[PDB]
Ligand binder design. Sequence first.
Ligand SMILES: O=C(Nc1ccc(C(=O)N[C@@H]2c3cccc(O)c3C[C@@H]2C(=O)O)c2scnc12)NC1CC1
Length: 167
Amino acid sequence: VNSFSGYLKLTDNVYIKNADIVEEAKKVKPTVVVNAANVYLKHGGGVAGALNKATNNAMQVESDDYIATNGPLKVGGSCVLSGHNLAKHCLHVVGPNVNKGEDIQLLKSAYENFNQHEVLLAPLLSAGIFGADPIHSLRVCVDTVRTNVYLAVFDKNLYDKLVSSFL
Ligand SMILES: O=C(Nc1ccc(C(=O)N[C@@H]2c3cccc(O)c3C[C@@H]2C(=O)O)c2scnc12)NC1CC1
């Protein structure tokens, strides 16, 4: 039993809710919240900008030190950093950004990072300002992630479309 509430069950291990991931993290304080990161951990907009704003920029400060030490992530890769006031840990995962021409096949590699964590609160990777089709992202999630994932979808209209079209 866990504290995630109001989710629709899509499969054995994947759950979905119309929710603001920031507000959901604040309320649940999950072990892991996933950030929709870029390789530079520059949390300017989208989910990343919102998560970072909710940490009062502490996520960005920590991220800048990480990059200065380690260099950029790979597209499809991830790193574990602090969850600050939102979660125990933040798993920063880089999905391909279609508006940069990155290969969408890398989306499966990106979701594979979730399998290193037993339970996660997450957005749909490569959705929103990353330019991918969210219906496709949900399909890859379901077909790749084997651990327990709670997906927060900000847009109510998109949430309803994702549920109604789910196979
Ligand atoms: O801003 C947040 N939280 C989140 C921000 C961005 C996102 C995000 O990238 N969503 C995508 C998006 C955005 C726009 C059009 C779209 O078709 C899609 C597909 C995805 C979706 O619809 O979910 C999310 S997902 C849960 N939470 C947040 N909190 C602050 C109080 C405002």
